[PDB]
Amino acid sequence: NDGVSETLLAWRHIDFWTSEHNPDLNATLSDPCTQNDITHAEEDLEVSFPNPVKASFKIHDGQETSGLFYGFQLMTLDQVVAMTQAWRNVAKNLNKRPDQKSIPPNAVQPVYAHPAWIPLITDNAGNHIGVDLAPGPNGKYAQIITFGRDFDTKFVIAENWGEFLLSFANDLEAGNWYLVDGELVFRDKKSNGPIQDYFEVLKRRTWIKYQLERPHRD
């Protein structure tokens, strides 16, 4: 019940999909990490990666570069370590010295940077999707969040990495894509909709899901 199953299922689809519809993108999916690579990374960052994340890394060590997630790049373990230390530097500088918010409220710490936010995806422009290993009081450990330069408001986009990868997989399978050989971008197929930034899609989905759930209290 950690999301490992989803991680594996998701990668099957994503692997098969890219090979069929975008071999060029498939070609960028790296070989697995070894357990040593992971132990080394865990020791460097003084952190324990969630099971589904470890699972994902043992399938592909990121990408080697048009990014897989509708333009956003799956980070290599080395990139994860480098960027995590980058964010850790930011958090220290901030210690000494734009309202930070969270959807759902109190799910994610209301801060610009946290040492326990491990980035796994990048827009190569300062923004990330990653795992939250230090949730707010109404958050969940190893929930998947957006954070970064332009993420003054953070979003919980999935309960775990597995469910994130799967919802991406389901978008591919549902035909919610346009090619621009080309660059992969999101469009909602059922609505006959325009091209949209995938972060905007994830944000709207989080926002909607939050709202449909508010009624329930118990």
Added chain:
Amino acid sequence: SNDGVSETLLAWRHIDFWTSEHNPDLNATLSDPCTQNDITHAEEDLEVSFPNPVKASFKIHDGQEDLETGTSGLFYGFQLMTLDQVVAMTQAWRNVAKNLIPDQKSIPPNAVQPVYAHPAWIPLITDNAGNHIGVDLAPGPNGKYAQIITFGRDFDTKFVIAENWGEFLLSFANDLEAGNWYLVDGELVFRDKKSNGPIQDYFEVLKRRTWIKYQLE
């Protein structure tokens, strides 16, 4: 390796020896160890992984209790909680957090989440009045995982009082060894010996020490 396990083992030696010499009645309240099963069961209940030094401490004493008044707590009146009490109280605070009180703050700033209650604040000590010392498994951006904090009903401002449970237990041990106490075998209370200090609430001592340490660190 650098988690405070050493310090936990060392501390409990000085604390076991001290109580036996200066307050056998208090020594008598220190429970037998937990088994690994007790701990695994607790970890499974709370869906949480206890830090190493905490596990170590539990495998020396499962808190304190006595049938015979109420329990005179080890930490200058504050009671070391049994694993059962830890599980029960953690679930109690988890209920509070779900149901959710002035501005919540942290010393050092941003070391502790600025909230009244968090599911990952595991209480280990109680004043039996709503307040705790415990482990923070979800620190703020300038905090440290498994740092030791004050929280509870009267702790709108939270304090990081140690880097880990080991260092906490040891600094308590050092207070005992420095003669910073007074018996009222009666009830154990804090006083600073080296200066001829008054009787003080131990929470007030820890708060002042944290505040001072924060300044010119």
